[PDB]
Write an enzyme that holds these catalytic residues in place. Structure first.
Site: not given
Length: 102
Positions: A18, A30, A91
């Site tokens: 992540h 994020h 991501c």
């Protein structure tokens, strides 16, 4: 050791990475599901118990934006939704776009 503002954070979650971006004073920017929104949260909470590290991998060939621009952009994106998949490819692309530009 504490990350510098603008540092890309690679969180080693079980079976998936992540990514986040450090914007100073304990916070990260994020993508997360509350269907996924840009959130400004504590690194402490986002990392959890999981192992993590700073990883500005593309810094050897690409030049990072001035740290003022990284933070202005990352923080002015907070609240905005992303209707796309939360893949580690995406991501990585989201945070790399904040650090390096487009």
């Amino acid at each position: 050791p504490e990350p510098k503002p603008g540092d890309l954070i690679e969180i080693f979650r079980p079976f998936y990475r992540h990514w986040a971006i450090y914007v100073g004073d304990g916070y990260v920017v994020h993508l997360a599901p509350p269907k996924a929104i840009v959130k400004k949260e504590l690194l402490y909470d986002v990392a959890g118990s999981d192992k993590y590290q700073v990883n500005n991998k593309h810094d050897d060939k690409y030049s990072p934006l001035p740290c003022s621009k990284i933070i202005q952009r990352a923080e002015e994106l907070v609240g905005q939704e992303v209707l796309y998949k939360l893949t580690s490819e995406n991501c990585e692309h989201f945070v790399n776009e904040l650090r390096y530009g487009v």
